[PDB]
Every structure is written in C-alpha cells, then in structure tokens.
C-alpha cells in the first residue's frame with residue numbers, strides 16, 4: 001500500500017493501476033506517466049475512482065478531491081481540487097523511457113533495446129513487465145487432449161479450436177495433468193515426458209505459466225575497484241596448467257565484478273575451475289541458466305576439485321536428468337553448482353555465472369538477490385546465442401542488448417578476453433575471428449584440411465515455421481558414401497524439422513545450432529536449410545561452425561556466409 005517510486009525513489013501512496021506490474025510512482029512521475037499514456041487508473045489506499053454512486057469515471061485527469069474523497073467533473077462538490085495539477089497527481093509525501101516499457105507489447109526489438117539502455121531501476125521494471133507479459137501470453141494457446149497412443153515415443157493429439165497451436169520443439173515445455181512436464185516432435189508426434197507414465201488417452205497438457213516475482217536487486221551491483229585482492233587468499237603454488245590465468249584471477253580479486261569474454265574453446269570452464277585452485281580457501285557458487293551449463297561446470301570440477309566439497313543443487317520439481325557425481329542439495333559445501341532458478345538464499349566468497357549470453361536481466365537480478373558475494377565473475381560470449389525471447393517477432397536483437405553484462409562486453413569491452421581457440425581447425429578459427437571477434441581470435445591448431453563448404457540452395461519445405469531441405473540432406477548422404485570417416489559426425493541445422501528428417505535418412509546424431517552451444521564434436525555436418533534471418537544470424541553461425549574439433553561440412557543456402565567461410569569448396 002505504501003512504497004517507493006520506481007523512477008525517482010520518492011515515497012508515495014500512488015501505484016499505476018493500468019501497469020501489469022502496478023509500479024509505485026511518485027506525485028511528479030505518476031502525473032508524467034498518466035498524461036502521456038492510455039494509463040489513467042491511479043491506485044492509492046483507495047483507488048482513484050468517482051465515489052458518487054454508480055459513476056464509472058476512473059480517469060485520474062477527469063477526477064478531483066472534494067473533502068477527503070474523489071469525484072469526477074459531474075459529481076465534484078463546490079470546494080474541489082483537480083487531482084492532476086502542477087505536474088502532479090495528488091497523493092502523499094508531495095520517464096519518457098518508463099512510458100515505453102509500461103505500454104509496449106514486447107514484440108519489437110526496440111523494446112528490448114530500451115529495457116537495456118534505461119536506468120538500473122527501469123531495467124528491473126522492464127524485466128518484471130516482460131516476464132509477466134511472456135507468462136500471460138502462455139495462457140493464450142490451445143489445450144492438447146490425447147486422442148490415442150501408438151508406442152513409448154509416439155501418440156496422436158486433439159487440439160483446442162479457436163485458440164492457436166503452439167510450436168512443437170523442446171523450446172516449449174508442456175505440463176501434463178499432474179503427470180509431469182512433457183515435450184513433442186512432429187501425423188505421428190513423438191511424446192517425451194519427464195516422468196515415464198504410460199500416456200493416458202484423454203489426459204491433457206497446458207503450458208505451465210509461473211508467477212513472476214518482483215525484482216529487488218540490480219542486474220549488476222555497483223562496480224568497486226580495489227588496491228589489493230579482497231577477501232580471497234591466493235596460492236603461490238598455483239598449478240602450471242592454470243598459470244595462463246594468474247593475472248586475470250588477480251583482476252577477479254581486485255574488482256567487485258568482472259566480465260570474461262571467452263570465444264568457443266578458449267578455456268572458459270578452465271578459467272572458472274582454476275579460479276577455485278587459485279583461491280583455494282574461497283567458497284564458490286557456480287551458476288548458469290541451463291542444467292547443461294551447470295553440468296558442464298560440474299564435469300570440469302570433478303577433474304580438478306575435491307568431490308566431497310562439491311554439491312549439485314537439484315530443484316525438487318525434477319524436470320530433466322542432470323549431474324549425478326556430487327552430493328545432492330548440500331547448500332553449505334565449499335563448491336555449490338546450481339541453476340539460477342534453483343539458487344538458494346546464501347553467501348559466497350566468489351560467484352561464477354557462466355554462459356552469460358543466455359542470461360536475461362531477470363536472471364541477473366535473481367542472482368544478485370539470492371547470492372551475496374565478495375566477487376562476481378560473468379563468463380560467456382556475446383558472439384554466442386542469447387536466451388530466446390518468445391514474444392519478439394519484429395527485428396533482430398543485437399548482442400549489446402542480450403543483458404547488462406553483454407551490453408558492457410560490447411560497449412566498454414570485457415575485463416578479460418580468452419584469445420586463443422584450442423578446439424577448432426584454423427579454417428573455422430579464422431572465419432569466426434573475422435566474422436564476430438574483430439580478428440582477435442587466434443588459432444591454436446593448424447588447418448585440418450577437413451573443413452568443406454558447398455553452395456547448395458536445394459528445396460525448402462515448411463512444417464509450420466520449422467524448415468526442411470531434403471536436397472541438402474541428400475547431398476550429405478552422397479558425401480558420406482565417399483567420406484566414411486564422417487560416419488562419426490554430428491548433424492547440425494538451425495531447424496528441428498530438418499534434423500528429424502536427417503536423423504531418419506542419415507542416421508547421424510542430431511543437434512540444433514542452439515542446443516549444440518557449449519558442446520564439441522570431432523566432425524560436424526551443418527546444413528543451413530534456409531537463407532532466412534534465423535539461419536543467417538552471425539551468432540548462430542558462429543556457434544554452428546565452432547562445434548567442430550577436426551572437420552566440418554557446411555551445406556550453405558546464403559551466398560554471403562558461404563563466401564565468408566574460409567573452407568575448401570566442394571562440387572556436386
């Protein structure tokens with residue numbers, strides 16, 4: 001009922017009744033908002049509505065204070081003050097960007113650009129508003145009632161009329177009813193339920209929308225710079241394997257927070273785990289948005305850090321299988337590995353947050369709200385894939401706008417930059433170096449002479465918005481007969497439908513460019529499928545070709561990215 005202004009902190013009884021988040025606005029800022037937007041409902045102890053019986057006047061501009069009550073022009077008593085006067089909405093204790101965040105639908109890229117260029121308190125309001133909007137949008141899709149069951153990985157569904165059909169990919173997790181979360185893949189659909197329950201005909205699914213909690217802590221704490229390493233105690237006996245990062249581990253102790261831009265295979269998990277061997281007394285909470293990224297940190301920690309002092313935090317509502325080698329849910333262990341949504345309310349000497357391009361400003365704030373740390377380290381790469389923004393359909397979101405950390409890495413540069421790629425053949429390293437790294441990524445390996453590119457547009461068929469290019473999978477099939485060493489390759493494409501087809505025709509294991517992020521394969525076969533803005537995204541293209549250690553075959557649709565690939569060209 002009584003709080004502080006989300007724009008200038010001035011205390012107030014006023015909240016905008018028309019904002020989806022009902023932000024507390026002060027007398028001055030509340031006016032500047034109601035007078036510039038369709039938002040005219042103002043909430044105090046009592047709402048600002050005409051007290052006259054059955055009068056439906058709720059617009060604060062058309063209301064007045066008569067005695068200690070509120071009335072419109074038609075019912076105001078002789079002695080009355082217009083609620084809107086002198087640039088103020090009457091309340092207690094007596095902005096252009098705030099209006100755009102309050103009224104936007106989050107479908108344009110300029111909406112996300114603003115949610116990142118604004119003040120710190122408006123970044124939290126934007127994050128709070130966007131997530132609530134994203135969640136209410138989930139209520140606006142049709143229910144799937146089972147019509148029949150084929151096998152243990154197949155069934156047929158009956159969709160709700162009038163309400164749309166949502167996309168079928170692991171990117172949209174349904175919730176069955178209460179028989180666990182379920183996923184689907186294209187008349188015979190594949191049912192992938194978290195719980196092994198014999199699919200009941202008639203049982204229905206619903207996209208589980210969660211309550212959006214208010215954000216309190218900033219996306220980034222205020223930066224502090226120190227004269228010496230603070231609260232952390234370094235070893236002088238620091239393993240030669242981690243000698244390359246000694247200087248950067250010292251920068252970590254001489255700042256409140258630090259940003260590390262680590263391109264593919266430059267030593268991000270090495271840096272993260274080596275930080276624990278450099279400050280061995282220090283308690284480190286390892287966080288990431290995805291379970292796969294918290295597990296990738298676990299696999300590196302298993303190798304270099306004592307298994308007893310490690311704990312893998314697993315949320316009680318167990319969704320997908322994760323890391324099984326640490327003691328589970330021991331919040332007090334020196335090394336805690338946990339996803340941002342499952343983070344407990346604790347403190348740490350250092351907090352490492354990896355895969356920073358996948359974080360949102362909502363995630364950044366949750367991290368600063370649940371973990372109080374001496375030091376914060378943000379590891380990732382703004383040249384890699386960001387979190388998918390389900391409501392965004394108009395315009396492409398640039399890296400400086402993924403989150404506050406990525407904004408810093410693209411504007412002032414990262415504090416630390418891992419510049420030598422030790423995974424990829426020089427053909428791949430030189431290509432991504434020129435494409436997204438300003439020629440600052442260096443190749444540790446030589447050219448493998450196993451990196452091929454083929455310009456083949458083929459034929460694009462659509463299965464709803466997901467694309468398939470059978471002539472591109474046919475060209476791969478031809479290639480494999482003549483290059484049987486490529487039998488061990490992972491098939492990568494920007495579309496799951498293209499992958500579903502290539503899995504049946506080639507038999508190769510399948511990965512979307514997005515699900516391949518953080519992983520490495522000896523050989524990669526990539527079919528671009530289409531020459532759309534999705535498949536031609538340079539961040540997605542960067543992740544696509546940097547998965548390969550030994551060889552890559554790129555069947556290209558785009559003349560632009562094909563001409564940018566520094567690979568051996570193939571004919572057919």
Ligand SMILES: c1n[nH]c(-c2nccs2)n1
Pocket residue numbers: 241244265266267268270422
């Ligand atoms: C030492 N300096 N960099 C590194 C690594 N880069 C890739 C994985 S480990 N070790």
Ligand SMILES: [Zn+2]
Pocket residue numbers: 005006007008009010025026027028029030
């Ligand atoms: Zn204010």
Ligand SMILES: [Zn+2]
Pocket residue numbers: 016017018019033039102
């Ligand atoms: Zn409003």
Ligand SMILES: [Zn+2]
Pocket residue numbers: 050051052055056057071072073074075076
């Ligand atoms: Zn009235």
